[PDB]
Amino acid sequence: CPFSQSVSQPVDERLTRAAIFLVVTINPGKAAEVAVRAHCSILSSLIRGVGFRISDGGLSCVMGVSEGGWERLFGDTKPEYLHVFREINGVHHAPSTPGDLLYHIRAARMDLCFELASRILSDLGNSVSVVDSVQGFRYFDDRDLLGFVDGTENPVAQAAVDATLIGDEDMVFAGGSYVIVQKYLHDLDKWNAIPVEQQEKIIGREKLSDIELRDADKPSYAHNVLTSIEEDGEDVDILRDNMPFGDPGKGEFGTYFIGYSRKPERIERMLENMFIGNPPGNYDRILDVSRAITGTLFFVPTTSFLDSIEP
Amino acid sequence: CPFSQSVSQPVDERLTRAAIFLVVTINPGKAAEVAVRAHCSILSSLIRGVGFRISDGGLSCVMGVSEGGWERLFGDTKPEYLHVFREINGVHHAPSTPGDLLYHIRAARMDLCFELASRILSDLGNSVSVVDSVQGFRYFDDRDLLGFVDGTENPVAQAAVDATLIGDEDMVFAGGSYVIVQKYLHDLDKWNAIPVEQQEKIIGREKLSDIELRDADKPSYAHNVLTSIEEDGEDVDILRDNMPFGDPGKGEFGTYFIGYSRKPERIERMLENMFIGNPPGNYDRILDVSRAITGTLFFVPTTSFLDSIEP
Amino acid sequence: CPFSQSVSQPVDERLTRAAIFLVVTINPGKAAEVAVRAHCSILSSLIRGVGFRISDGGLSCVMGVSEGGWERLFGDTKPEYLHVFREINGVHHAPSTPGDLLYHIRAARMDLCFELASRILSDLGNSVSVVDSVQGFRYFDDRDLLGFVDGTENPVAQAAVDATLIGDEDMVFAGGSYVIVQKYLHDLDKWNAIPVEQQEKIIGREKLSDIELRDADKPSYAHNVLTSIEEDGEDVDILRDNMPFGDPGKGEFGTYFIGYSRKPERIERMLENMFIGNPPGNYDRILDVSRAITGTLFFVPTTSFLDSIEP
Amino acid sequence: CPFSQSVSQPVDERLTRAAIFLVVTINPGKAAEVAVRAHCSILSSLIRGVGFRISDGGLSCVMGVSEGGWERLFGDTKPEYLHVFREINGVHHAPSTPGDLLYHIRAARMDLCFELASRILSDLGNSVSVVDSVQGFRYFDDRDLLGFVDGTENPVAQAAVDATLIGDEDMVFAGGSYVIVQKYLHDLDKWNAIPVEQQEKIIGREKLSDIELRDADKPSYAHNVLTSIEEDGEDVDILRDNMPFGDPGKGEFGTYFIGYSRKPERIERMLENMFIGNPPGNYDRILDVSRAITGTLFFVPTTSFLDSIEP
Amino acid sequence: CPFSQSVSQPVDERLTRAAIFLVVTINPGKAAEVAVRAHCSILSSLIRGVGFRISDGGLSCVMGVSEGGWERLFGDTKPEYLHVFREINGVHHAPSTPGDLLYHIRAARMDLCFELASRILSDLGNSVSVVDSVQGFRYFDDRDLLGFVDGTENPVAQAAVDATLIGDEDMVFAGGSYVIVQKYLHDLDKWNAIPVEQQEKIIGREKLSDIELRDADKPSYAHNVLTSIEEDGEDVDILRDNMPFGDPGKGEFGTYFIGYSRKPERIERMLENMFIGNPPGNYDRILDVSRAITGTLFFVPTTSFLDSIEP
Amino acid sequence: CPFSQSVSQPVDERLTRAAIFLVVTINPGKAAEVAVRAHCSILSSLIRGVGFRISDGGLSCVMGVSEGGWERLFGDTKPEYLHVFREINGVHHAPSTPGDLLYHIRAARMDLCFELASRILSDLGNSVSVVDSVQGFRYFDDRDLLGFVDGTENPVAQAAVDATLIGDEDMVFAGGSYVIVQKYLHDLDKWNAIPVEQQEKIIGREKLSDIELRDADKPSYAHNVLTSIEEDGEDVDILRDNMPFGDPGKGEFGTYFIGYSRKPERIERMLENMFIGNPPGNYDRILDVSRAITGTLFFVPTTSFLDSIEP
């Protein structure tokens, strides 16, 4: 019975009022690998120490390893579906970016994430180089920067566990997951110039009432229509924890999309439908106001596996 | 009876869990001045609209105008003590930076400050250029990044009103104030290498217990000793709302110092004592781990005066 | 593994600060049946949409179908214990009232229940006719209008699951339940004229201390004595969520009794003991100040069964 | 220094999550007048007793007396502006309804208002007859049933005191106020069929962002334009505490408008502008979906005056 | 304008969930007096330091000096009404106990009071000897150990200020107050054996409903009747903050009565009415189940006076 | 499936803001045993009644029986590891104290524990004699009186269940546990005189940051090093709920250590390592400032076993 990381529990508990996405790369050399492998076993103790002081803080941290990082750190067989993120070249472009270790830190207060990230980076020292560091926050009542409520159709409780945690398909990694991260920059002026009814149709839900739309009223290019896919005749869901972020001073507004799954094929299919179009040419209008500049895939191993690594 | 801005009330209410310091400069041309003057009268309506939706949000915004901005916008006589911030050249350097308008936004949640700053910048458009935009947050239990509780000796209720709000010295501006803003970048590795007793003596208070030290145990260069000054034989206090800020990914850690007063002479004297030393050469050791890179002085007029400007 | 509705979880979580009981009847005609069957599959999506926006809202909705409604909607075999509620003619009368669909909506705030009920009724349109619509609220510290704490002896966690959810007795409906609803109108003047010790003995517990009474001090007609019944030599419990309601202007005060079980025989036996008396003539004095005007029985199917209906 | 009732303090404190408007008429006979006059002096003790038990409950009650009630109860000179509410016959009709005593009860929980109203009605007994009894609740984030945030432009702190409390114009009643109550029933289907931009223009603010509109974009019949009036060249504000209410089962949806002032002439002018039109024929479109069925004017005396009445 | 201590503000704010009453005596010798006089000026700094860390903690501390302590510490003229507490010998006995300094510490959490008391005692060292140290806590919903709600008839806001703070009767001490402290030990078995109606009549209010009783139903020996006294034909109120306390293990149950006034004559008259009887022989039945073992009177000077003492 | 008591659930839920440890002895005679056996079956009903009224109160009570109490009450075979606590005579002394029944009461408020303890003692009457009664409270942010965060390394969720609840080693008592209680009195003056770095090394963690220390920096006598033991090559954890307590007036400061386990051998080994030393002579320095005066071992049976006892 391998203990799994806090992947779906924080979402269901619904306490993440602040988050930090930290994508770092391992510097060349064996010493950096040794330092990272040593810090792997103490990550859990750091998590407990940093978040025990602030009760009801909901502090959690998910560590993910990409294909290159896993090749550099653990040379044993890799998971079945672990591979470099595939770029998509359709009506829009989804680039692939370097990354070896992903730290997704969530807490009910920003200071907890700040302290945990500072401790992690200080312990890692010069062994890693920070590639991306995004500080996301909950915007109003679970709304994103486009004004629409996000996260409604996420699976809850047992459904989330069945959708994210890997079963017996890859026993040697039972309890792991696959995470896909992307960063979108929004064109708020263009979105705001769009009439409210057009946004109504594009998203496929309602703005204020957050109630869905009837199948007779949702066009073929609705966001929730293109992202609805099925396997073996049954609909399969993924866990999303998109977080708004930005800096007003530089005029930067964006959303950090993060998706957990037991199979990255589902998320890749959803990305293909959104970018290439299903059928081709029928792309999602959301990409007309949102630009993707960062995208990567990581593997999330079990907590016991992390605690079982010897330097 | 001129209505004063929310200068001391937010501090006493103690609800600022997040803040944004936005220092912008007015672009050359009369059109930019006209746009700023028009937005001046609608700032209050924007504040009310943005912060009424989130009850117990504690949203407040203080707008300050520097000497150059006041000269460009209102050509009538200026306040008595409004002048360009004086740089200090002692054992350390405190630079002076350009700035025309200061927006100090405070709220119990980050999203309110985000929305207010975005609305203000969108309304201002191209008339202003953003010089500095710092997002500060409350760190643990009112502690700064150095680990010491900050804000203990702030005046409360009537004392704060008497210390910040201008009396009859400049009737034509009764209800205004002077605000001095600085940005400090910390060297946390050097501070952490310092023994706990040395930090104990340098700050002049205790770390955990936050209790003061006896006058027989505080050296002449204690931080709370050098910052204690008197006028006409009576001690005079200032209102401080320093806010920690930073980005772990770039390794940036700092504190945004903000000080309100009825007379900037007090804050300038405190800065002279800290940097030059009282007596000279006996500087505060805090500057040995903190570097000042931004410093400016602004004037905060009354709410009625802001509402009374005609474009 | 059929997913069960939120029957016992809201009670154990203890967040229902407001509730709406909506008993409606299906209008004659096949079109109304088709509309209800279509709305059955979208009820869950409506629930999620309406209650995701208000975090920690605890919004839940239980839909129940009576014998006539089940006969009109699904013509396949009915559950084993689904039948028209039996009226009781003893010292008091418990009438039976028409009803086809029951909506029990619970939330921590009244507005969520209001929005959900409005959406449900708007979607149903003219296909249904509202028979009863009662808005109940939590009165002080879980007290009913008679001044006594109610809900103390409810089963918690696993006991509630074993008492409410149907096991293998009716496999084809595993995960369902039976719900019995009644509406009582109180005579508060008569109850208040009764001495505190007489109410002490009638209820069988204490008023303020909410502690029980010794078996030597509880008469044979104590409320908690007559409602304590056993099956096969073992005591069996039922889940109750009685909610006070009323309108001061019309002088209307009452309690909405709702009871969930895996077998309605237990609740019917409890009703027989309370009304007819055990032994006959030894009725509960609570009925001397409370009048029952509405009573109905419904069947609560599983969430998966509701989602699996095709129009 | 006459102590004033909690007229503006509850609004500024912003804790009214539930309210009850109870309009009753005094039955003919001297005994009813004597009973009401006796209960007048014990109303404050009842208020304290009922609301002291639930800390942070924010329980308050405002008692108002109409012209007829004041004539029947106190035969001394009446306030200057106390008169029967004037009906308005323009494009829409605003009826006048009987009423002698008004009880506006507000609390953070519904049960407190329930208990206070029940106690008041029980103490009054048969001396009064209930004419209207409306239970209002806060809908989502201070939004009314039309989906727009209401209460943004209300005066706060000293402005509210100067707008509601009577000064020296009628010394003998210093500290009193005038309250105008109306009940509106909404046609939600017609409002919802209206496009979002048309509602945008009709209300004069924005829906989600709750930010105002520029004077170049608000038509002459915007709701906030017609309700903006001035006295002696200065804009004068009134205090509004409109509360949504309704029953889904009967399909009843409405808003209870309540307005406090030091002079009812302002509210009457606002009503004339909304109904007759300014200029005539340019009425507010809100009345096209809202029907007024109840409207009355009451006088709110000081707490000391209420405590000083001898039976 | 002398600043007054937090005497009435904590009660009106209603945040005291825990309190510590510490009555200590000054050891003989001039050194103890010097140490106490030195700690007097740093008490405020200690208060701020100890309670700034726990936001919304509501930490306050009132220091009072008795007649002997004032004679030993300050040899200048004493307040007009400062004298040794007078023992009362009627049907019951109210003893007088030694005491020089009184510390009434209040906070929303017990740990704050613990820390403040520990710091005060550590700073005082051997200069003082602890006579009494009682840890009181709020019992349920502002109820005392007898089951009745206490504190309902306390003056609020301006009335409390006028009742507690000394006016111009003793200018040299404007802003001070007089505090009377007593400790009562309850006989809960005897009180519980008393019927609920007899307790109803003895207290003079209701138990659950906390509503008063009509003057025709309250006997002459009701607790709220004997404690209602008038000066110059006008009723005068006092501020009470009675706190339940006890230890179950030793079977000790009691109430710590504390009363603030601008004139101790009112509290002494109330004590005479309760113990001797008004008329004599008509004593309060509360003393039949409560025994007084400690009683003392102290003077509370202004905060500025405390800060102005030089060792 | 025997239902287990609330042993690990309250700790994981993290709501114990107040606790009472009540160690009592059974008086000689069969009547006392009969009374205790009768109260055993009603303890659960008392718990539910006392803690249902205060929602989110987190009230729980654990009843434990020592070897002598179990011999006097139930004469059937005892658990495998139930025995009298063994005193330890090394560099320090850990005494053994009499005790028959242990009541560990926990709640989010002190009043709930007070009421429950009072009810339990009143029901027990003269059948038991109170030996120890300690009222503990949470000190600041889960810190003990020594200033270090305590409870960080406690097992959570499934690990706690596996560490505390007895498996199949003693089937007849499956679901029980063993609890070891000790009372330590602290010498705060000696601890405070110790430099912060020496406390840093003695505890083995950090004070403010609550982060652990590297194995190269923790000496052999670190507290967390000596208390880390293994069974069969695997580390085994125990559940600790130490609670600070004391009385400032008497200068009494201490910590009540409580430890739950499926095997008391682990706790006895930890005590031997701390007191005797591992290797001998290398004792924990914590005992140099803390004195143990009370120590006892009890057995905690299942809830079903308690409910199944017949008087």
Ligand code: HEM
């Ligand atoms: C800036 C980027 C995006 C934004 C602002 C956005 C926004 C939204 C919103 C508002 C909804 C409806 C609320 C809900 O269903 O919970 C939604 C639905 C959804 N989106 Fe996105 N989305 C973005 C990108 C993506 C991407 C890249 C994916 C997958 C690779 C994705 C997958 C989904 C899924 C699975 C749903 C649920 C629809 C359903 O279950 O019917 N989204 N999105």
Ligand code: HEM
């Ligand atoms: C206006 C109607 C009623 C009121 C005010 C009322 C009130 C109460 C109260 C105050 C208690 C004790 C608190 C508690 O046990 O949690 C209780 C117990 C109980 N009542 Fe009711 N009751 C009503 C009707 C009913 C009905 C109609 C039934 C069943 C058909 C019922 C079944 C029970 C049960 C099972 C218990 C638990 C007793 C035990 O477990 O020993 N009640 N009731």
Ligand code: HEM
């Ligand atoms: C164990 C001791 C006492 C207990 C349990 C107790 C309890 C109560 C209670 C329950 C009330 C009604 C609640 C309220 O009026 O707020 C009350 C009223 C009052 N008591 Fe006490 N009391 C005690 C001793 C005293 C003493 C010694 C005094 C004065 C020296 C006093 C002065 C008052 C006053 C002024 C009132 C307000 C009555 C009114 O305003 O009409 N009490 N007491």
Ligand code: HEM
């Ligand atoms: C006054 C007495 C004691 C105090 C103040 C104290 C304090 C502490 C502190 C601050 C920690 C580190 C925080 C943590 O690990 O959660 C700790 C660790 C621990 N202590 Fe204690 N302790 C005391 C007595 C004991 C005793 C008597 C035992 C066992 C019989 C014990 C067993 C443990 C254990 C198991 C740990 C966890 C260490 C680890 O998992 O590596 N403690 N103690």
